C-alpha cells in the first residue's frame, strides 16, 4: 500500500546492466549472469522506527546488506550498518544512502565500471555528491 | 449538494473517507487547519481531480482558489493555507461506486515551490512524437502544473528533445527535476523563465525520469490551457 519500495522480495541490478544480477560471491557483493537462484534475490523490509530499509538476502535469510571498515558492501548479523535510505530518481532507478554519515558526508553504493561493463567488479560504498554520479545508480526491480 | 464537515482542524496529516452514498452527486467538503502552512490534498489516485475554494466567514465571501474539473484527470493539489479562514474543496461525479479517500498533507520540503496550483498527473508519454493536455485555465498570476515522466528506460544516459509549449495563452514556465525518498519529493530547480506561448527551443531531458513544469499564466487569451509536450529522439 506504500508505493515507495513497497515490501517484499527483489532484484538488484546497476543501471550500466539490465541482465547483471547483485549476489554475494566470497565475502564481496558483485554483479554476476542471471542464477534463477535464491542468491540473487532480496528481501526489502521498510523500518519504521528508523524510517530506512533493511535488505537481506533470501538464501541467507539473517544475512543483511552492510559495509565492513574498508568501503566494502558485506552480508552481515543485523547492525546499524545495515540500514539503508533510498533515493528514486526514475521509475525503478535508486541511490542507496547509509544512515551513518561520516563527516558531513553520504555514502552510496557505488560499482566499479570498464566502459560500461562491471563483470567482477567488488561492490564499495563511496561518498556521494549529486544524483548524476552512474556508478551509484541502481535498479530494484519487485519479483 | 450534501456539504460535509470536518469538524475538528487537521494537522499534518489526515485522511477522509467518501461515503460512497453522495458519489452521485457534486459534493463538498468543508475543513481547517490546525496551523497555518502548505498541504497536499488528494484523492486516492489522484483521481478525480478536487476543486479548493477559500471561506471568509452566514458567511462573507467563497474565492476560488485552485483546482479544476476534467473527468478521468489526475491531479493533486498543492495550496497554502491559513487557519484562520474557512476551506471548501468540491469533489466531482464518481460516476464509479469504488469509495475514494481524500489525502491532506503538510508539505515541509521542495513542493513548497508549487503553492498555489493543481499539479496534472501525465501518464501517456509512451513514445516520441505530439501530445498535448487541455485544461481550463488559471488567470493572469496563477499557477497550473505538470507532472510527466519522460519514455525510454533510464540509464543517466539516454535522453529525449522535449518541445514544451502552449497554444494561445502566454505562460511563464519553471521546470524542476524530481527525485523522492520516504520524506516525499526532492526537487530541483533546472530551469527558469521559460515563455510557453509558441516556444521553439527544445530541452534535452533523461529518458525515464520524472520531471514538473510550473505554469505562471501571464495572458489570458483562451478559456482553456493547452499545453504541448513533443517528444523526439
Request: aromatic share 12%.
Amino acid at each position: 500500500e506504500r508505493t515507495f519500495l513497497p515490501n517484499g522480495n527483489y532484484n538488484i541490478k546497476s543501471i550500466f546492466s539490465g541482465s547483471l544480477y547483485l549476489n554475494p560471491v566470497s565475502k564481496s557483493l558483485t554483479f554476476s549472469n542471471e542464477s534463477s537462484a535464491n542468491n540473487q534475490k532480496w528481501n526489502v523490509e521498510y523500518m519504521a522506527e528508523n524510517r530506512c530499509f533493511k535488505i537481506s538476502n533470501v538464501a541467507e535469510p539473517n544475512k543483511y546488506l552492510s559495509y565492513d571498515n574498508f568501503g566494502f558492501i558485506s552480508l552481515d548479523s543485523l547492525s546499524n550498518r545495515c540500514y539503508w535510505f533510498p533515493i528514486k530518481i526514475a521509475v525503478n532507478t535508486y541511490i542507496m544512502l547509509s544512515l551513518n554519515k561520516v563527516n558531513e558526508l553520504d555514502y552510496a553504493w557505488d560499482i566499479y565500471d570498464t566502459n560500461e561493463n562491471i563483470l567482477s567488479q567488488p561492490l564499495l560504498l563511496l561518498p556521494n555528491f549529486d544524483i548524476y554520479n552512474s556508478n551509484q545508480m541502481f535498479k530494484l526491480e519487485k519479483i | 449538494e450534501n456539504i460535509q464537515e470536518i469538524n475538528t482542524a487537521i494537522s499534518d496529516n489526515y485522511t477522509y473517507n467518501i461515503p460512497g452514498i453522495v458519489n452521485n452527486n457534486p459534493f463538498y467538503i468543508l475543513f481547517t487547519v490546525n496551523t497555518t502552512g502548505i498541504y497536499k490534498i488528494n484523492a486516492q489516485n489522484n483521481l478525480p481531480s478536487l476543486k479548493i475554494y477559500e471561506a471568509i466567514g452566514d458567511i462573507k465571501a467563497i474565492n476560488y482558489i485552485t483546482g479544476f474539473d476534467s473527468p478521468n484527470a489526475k491531479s493533486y493539489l498543492v495550496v497554502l493555507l491559513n487557519k484562520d479562514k474557512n476551506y471548501y474543496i468540491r469533489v466531482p461525479q464518481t460516476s464509479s461506486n469504488i469509495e475514494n479517500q481524500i489525502q491532506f498533507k503538510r508539505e515541509e520540503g521542495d513542493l513548497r515551490n508549487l503553492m498555489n496550483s493543481s499539479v496534472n498527473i501525465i501518464d501517456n508519454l509512451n513514445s516520441t512524437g505530439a501530445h498535448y493536455y487541455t485544461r481550463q485555465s488559471p488567470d493572469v498570476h496563477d499557477y497550473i502544473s505538470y507532472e510527466f515522466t519522460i519514455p525510454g528506460n533510464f540509464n543517466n544516459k539516454d535522453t529525449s528533445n522535449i518541445r514544451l509549449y502552449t497554444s494561445y495563452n502566454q505562460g511563464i514556465g519553471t521546470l524542476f527535476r524530481v527525485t523522492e525518498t520516504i520524506d516525499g519529493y526532492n526537487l530541483i530547480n533546472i530551469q527558469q523563465n521559460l515563455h510557453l506561448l509558441n516556444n521553439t527551443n527544445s530541452i534535452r531531458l533523461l529518458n525515464g525520469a520524472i520531471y514538473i513544469l510550473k505554469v505562471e499564466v501571464t495572458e489570458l487569451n483562451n478559456y482553456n490551457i493547452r499545453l504541448h509536450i513533443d517528444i523526439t529522439n
